Protein backbone atom coordinates (compact mmCIF):
# COMPACT_ATOMS: atom_id res chain seq x y z
CA UNK A 1 0.00 0.00 0.00
CA UNK A 2 1.54 3.31 1.12
CA UNK A 3 4.21 1.76 3.36
CA UNK A 4 5.86 0.11 0.35
CA UNK A 5 6.02 3.36 -1.61
CA UNK A 6 7.68 5.32 1.20
CA UNK A 7 10.13 2.42 1.52
CA UNK A 8 11.09 2.48 -2.16
CA UNK A 9 11.60 6.23 -1.83
CA UNK A 10 14.17 5.63 0.92
CA UNK A 11 15.79 3.03 -1.34
CA UNK A 12 15.99 5.47 -4.27
CA UNK A 13 17.83 7.96 -2.05
CA UNK A 14 20.27 5.44 -0.59
CA UNK A 15 20.81 4.22 -4.14
CA UNK A 16 21.74 7.56 -5.71
CA UNK A 17 23.93 8.35 -2.69
CA UNK A 18 25.83 5.18 -3.59
CA UNK A 19 25.64 5.81 -7.33
CA UNK A 20 27.52 9.08 -7.07
CA UNK A 21 30.28 7.71 -4.82
CA UNK A 22 31.01 4.85 -7.19
CA UNK A 23 30.99 7.08 -10.27
CA UNK A 24 33.37 9.46 -8.47
CA UNK A 25 35.88 6.68 -7.75
CA UNK A 26 35.50 4.50 -10.89
CA UNK A 27 36.70 7.36 -13.11
CA UNK A 28 40.04 7.43 -14.89
CA UNK A 29 40.64 10.95 -13.70
CA UNK A 30 40.93 9.36 -10.27
CA UNK A 31 44.60 8.45 -9.71
CA UNK A 32 44.21 6.77 -6.32
CA UNK A 33 41.63 4.31 -7.71
CA UNK A 34 44.15 1.47 -7.78
CA UNK A 35 45.19 2.12 -4.19
CA UNK A 36 41.53 1.94 -3.20
CA UNK A 37 40.81 -1.26 -5.19
CA UNK A 38 43.73 -2.76 -3.25
CA UNK A 39 41.45 -3.07 -0.16
CA UNK A 40 38.94 -5.90 0.25
CA UNK A 41 35.50 -5.54 1.81
CA UNK A 42 33.43 -8.25 3.45
CA UNK A 43 30.43 -9.16 1.30
CA UNK A 44 26.96 -10.34 2.34
CA UNK A 45 26.39 -14.08 2.35
CA UNK A 46 23.18 -13.11 0.48
CA UNK A 47 21.11 -9.89 0.23
CA UNK A 48 17.38 -10.14 -0.51
CA UNK A 49 15.59 -8.48 2.45
CA UNK A 50 16.08 -5.14 4.18
CA UNK A 51 17.60 -6.54 7.40
CA UNK A 52 20.65 -7.68 5.41
CA UNK A 53 21.57 -3.98 5.25
CA UNK A 54 23.27 -4.64 8.59
CA UNK A 55 26.18 -6.02 6.55
CA UNK A 56 26.34 -2.80 4.54
CA UNK A 57 26.05 -0.82 7.78
CA UNK A 58 28.94 -2.75 9.28
CA UNK A 59 31.31 -2.05 6.40
CA UNK A 60 30.40 1.65 6.47
CA UNK A 61 33.43 2.65 8.54
CA UNK A 62 36.06 0.87 6.35
CA UNK A 63 34.32 2.31 3.29
CA UNK A 64 34.76 5.91 4.35
CA UNK A 65 38.38 5.06 5.15
CA UNK A 66 38.61 4.31 1.42
CA UNK A 67 36.96 7.53 0.31
CA UNK A 68 39.24 9.71 2.45
CA UNK A 69 41.98 8.35 0.18
CA UNK A 70 40.82 10.68 -2.59
CA UNK A 71 41.93 14.11 -1.37
CA UNK A 72 40.48 16.34 -4.07
CA UNK A 73 36.69 16.69 -4.27
CA UNK A 74 35.00 15.26 -7.35
CA UNK A 75 31.75 16.00 -5.51
CA UNK A 76 32.96 18.68 -3.00
CA UNK A 77 31.17 17.62 0.19
CA UNK A 78 32.71 16.19 3.40
CA UNK A 79 32.77 12.39 2.94
CA UNK A 80 31.27 12.16 6.44
CA UNK A 81 28.19 13.92 5.04
CA UNK A 82 27.52 11.29 2.36
CA UNK A 83 28.42 8.47 4.76
CA UNK A 84 26.19 9.74 7.57
CA UNK A 85 23.22 10.53 5.31
CA UNK A 86 23.58 6.98 3.97
CA UNK A 87 23.90 5.61 7.52
CA UNK A 88 20.70 7.37 8.60
CA UNK A 89 18.84 5.97 5.59
CA UNK A 90 20.20 2.50 6.44
CA UNK A 91 18.91 2.72 10.01
CA UNK A 92 15.54 3.92 8.71
CA UNK A 93 15.42 0.62 6.68
CA UNK A 94 19.33 -4.16 14.42
CA UNK A 95 20.00 -7.75 13.27
CA UNK A 96 22.66 -10.43 12.71
CA UNK A 97 24.77 -10.48 9.54
CA UNK A 98 26.61 -13.40 7.96
CA UNK A 99 29.20 -12.54 5.31
CA UNK A 100 30.54 -14.18 2.22
CA UNK A 101 33.70 -16.24 2.44
CA UNK A 102 35.81 -13.80 0.39
CA UNK A 103 36.27 -10.02 0.37
CA UNK A 104 35.97 -7.91 -2.75
CA UNK A 105 36.83 -4.55 -4.28
CA UNK A 106 35.15 -1.28 -3.31
CA UNK A 107 33.66 -1.24 -6.82
CA UNK A 108 32.40 -4.79 -6.32
CA UNK A 109 30.86 -3.97 -2.92
CA UNK A 110 29.03 -0.91 -4.28
CA UNK A 111 27.84 -2.64 -7.44
CA UNK A 112 26.37 -5.30 -5.14
CA UNK A 113 24.45 -2.95 -2.86
CA UNK A 114 23.31 -0.70 -5.74
CA UNK A 115 21.98 -3.73 -7.59
CA UNK A 116 20.36 -4.68 -4.28
CA UNK A 117 18.51 -1.39 -3.85
CA UNK A 118 17.19 -1.47 -7.41
CA UNK A 119 16.29 -5.14 -6.91
CA UNK A 120 14.20 -4.38 -3.84
CA UNK A 121 12.54 -1.34 -5.43
CA UNK A 122 11.48 -3.46 -8.40
CA UNK A 123 10.34 -6.16 -5.96
CA UNK A 124 7.94 -4.02 -3.93
CA UNK A 125 6.09 -2.12 -6.69
CA UNK A 126 4.53 -5.48 -7.61
CA UNK A 127 1.15 -6.68 -6.15
Amino acid sequence: SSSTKKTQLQLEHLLLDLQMILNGINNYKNPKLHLMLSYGFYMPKKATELKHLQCLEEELKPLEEVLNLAQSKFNHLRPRDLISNINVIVLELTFMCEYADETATIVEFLNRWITFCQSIISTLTAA
Binding site: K32, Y39, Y42, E58, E59, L60, K61, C97, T103
Partner: protein
Protein backbone atom coordinates in the same frame (compact mmCIF):
# COMPACT_ATOMS: atom_id res chain seq x y z
CA UNK B 1 49.94 16.04 3.11
CA UNK B 2 50.27 14.74 -0.46
CA UNK B 3 50.36 10.97 -1.05
CA UNK B 4 52.19 9.07 -3.76
CA UNK B 5 49.54 7.48 -5.93
CA UNK B 6 52.10 4.71 -6.61
CA UNK B 7 54.16 2.56 -4.32
CA UNK B 8 57.95 2.77 -4.26
CA UNK B 9 59.72 0.70 -6.92
CA UNK B 10 60.64 -2.91 -6.29
CA UNK B 11 64.19 -4.24 -6.53
CA UNK B 12 64.67 -7.99 -7.05
CA UNK B 13 65.62 -9.45 -3.64
CA UNK B 14 65.44 -6.12 -1.81
CA UNK B 15 63.26 -4.49 0.84
CA UNK B 16 62.53 -0.77 1.26
CA UNK B 17 61.99 0.48 4.82
CA UNK B 18 61.86 4.00 6.24
CA UNK B 19 63.58 5.98 8.99
CA UNK B 20 60.96 8.71 9.45
CA UNK B 21 57.28 8.18 8.70
CA UNK B 22 56.03 11.56 7.48
CA UNK B 23 52.78 12.99 8.88
CA UNK B 24 50.44 11.60 6.28
CA UNK B 25 52.00 8.14 6.02
CA UNK B 26 49.48 5.31 6.44
CA UNK B 27 49.99 1.69 7.46
CA UNK B 28 47.70 -1.06 6.17
CA UNK B 29 46.02 -3.43 8.63
CA UNK B 30 47.18 -6.74 7.14
CA UNK B 31 46.69 -10.00 8.99
CA UNK B 32 48.70 -13.24 9.05
CA UNK B 33 47.91 -16.17 6.78
CA UNK B 34 44.56 -17.38 8.02
CA UNK B 35 43.44 -14.14 9.68
CA UNK B 36 40.83 -11.57 8.70
CA UNK B 37 40.55 -8.10 10.27
CA UNK B 38 37.51 -7.70 12.50
CA UNK B 39 34.22 -7.00 10.79
CA UNK B 40 33.77 -3.19 11.03
CA UNK B 41 37.51 -2.94 11.60
CA UNK B 42 39.95 -0.33 10.41
CA UNK B 43 41.51 -1.10 7.04
CA UNK B 44 44.57 1.00 7.92
CA UNK B 45 46.15 3.28 10.53
CA UNK B 46 47.27 6.85 9.88
CA UNK B 47 49.73 9.42 11.25
CA UNK B 48 48.76 12.78 12.76
CA UNK B 49 52.52 17.36 18.67
CA UNK B 50 51.82 14.56 16.17
CA UNK B 51 51.17 10.79 16.50
CA UNK B 52 49.14 7.94 14.99
CA UNK B 53 45.43 7.21 15.38
CA UNK B 54 43.26 4.06 14.95
CA UNK B 55 44.28 0.45 15.65
CA UNK B 56 44.18 -2.95 13.93
CA UNK B 57 42.42 -6.16 15.02
CA UNK B 58 42.28 -9.61 13.34
CA UNK B 59 40.31 -12.84 13.72
CA UNK B 60 40.05 -16.18 11.94
CA UNK B 61 59.88 14.74 15.55
CA UNK B 62 57.75 16.27 12.83
CA UNK B 63 56.76 12.68 12.03
CA UNK B 64 55.12 9.73 13.67
CA UNK B 65 57.30 6.83 14.75
CA UNK B 66 57.26 3.09 13.96
CA UNK B 67 53.89 1.89 15.26
CA UNK B 68 53.88 -0.91 17.82
CA UNK B 69 52.72 -4.31 16.55
CA UNK B 70 49.32 -5.95 16.75
CA UNK B 71 48.12 -9.49 17.34
CA UNK B 72 48.36 -11.82 14.33
CA UNK B 73 49.58 -9.18 11.88
CA UNK B 74 51.00 -10.51 8.63
CA UNK B 75 54.78 -10.62 8.82
CA UNK B 76 55.20 -8.15 5.94
CA UNK B 77 54.23 -4.63 6.95
CA UNK B 78 52.72 -2.43 4.22
CA UNK B 79 52.79 1.38 4.14
CA UNK B 80 51.90 4.18 1.74
CA UNK B 81 53.92 7.37 1.77
CA UNK B 82 53.41 11.10 1.37
CA UNK B 83 55.79 13.19 -0.73
CA UNK B 84 59.25 13.92 0.62
CA UNK B 85 59.31 10.47 2.23
CA UNK B 86 62.64 8.75 1.73
CA UNK B 87 62.47 4.96 1.57
CA UNK B 88 65.78 3.09 1.98
CA UNK B 89 66.48 -0.19 0.14
CA UNK B 90 68.40 -3.14 1.66
CA UNK B 91 69.14 -6.53 0.17
CA UNK B 92 67.68 -9.79 1.50
CA UNK B 93 69.74 -12.28 3.47
CA UNK B 94 71.83 -14.58 1.34
CA UNK B 95 72.33 -11.73 -1.07
CA UNK B 96 74.69 -8.77 -1.45
CA UNK B 97 74.38 -5.32 -3.04
CA UNK B 98 76.36 -3.39 -5.64
CA UNK B 99 74.73 0.07 -5.23
CA UNK B 100 75.64 0.95 -8.78
CA UNK B 101 73.95 4.27 -8.05
CA UNK B 102 71.89 5.45 -5.04
CA UNK B 103 70.06 2.90 -2.90
CA UNK B 104 67.04 5.02 -1.89
CA UNK B 105 63.86 6.46 -3.41
CA UNK B 106 61.78 9.57 -2.77
CA UNK B 107 58.09 10.38 -3.29
CA UNK B 108 58.30 13.45 -5.56
CA UNK B 109 55.59 15.45 -7.32
CA UNK B 110 56.42 17.08 -10.66
CA UNK B 111 53.81 19.42 -12.23
CA UNK B 112 51.11 17.57 -10.27
CA UNK B 113 52.29 13.96 -10.80
CA UNK B 114 53.57 11.65 -8.06
CA UNK B 115 56.68 9.63 -8.92
CA UNK B 116 59.41 7.67 -7.15
CA UNK B 117 63.03 8.40 -8.03
CA UNK B 118 64.40 5.20 -9.49
CA UNK B 119 66.91 3.61 -7.09
CA UNK B 120 69.95 1.87 -8.56
CA UNK B 121 70.76 -1.41 -6.81
CA UNK B 122 70.81 -5.17 -7.34
CA UNK B 123 71.84 -8.11 -5.17
CA UNK B 124 73.99 -11.19 -5.87
CA UNK B 125 74.37 -14.18 -3.57
Amino acid sequence: AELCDDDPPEIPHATFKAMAYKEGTMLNCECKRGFRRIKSGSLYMLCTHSSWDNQCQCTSPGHCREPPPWENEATERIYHFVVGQMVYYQCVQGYRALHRGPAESVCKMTHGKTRWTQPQLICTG
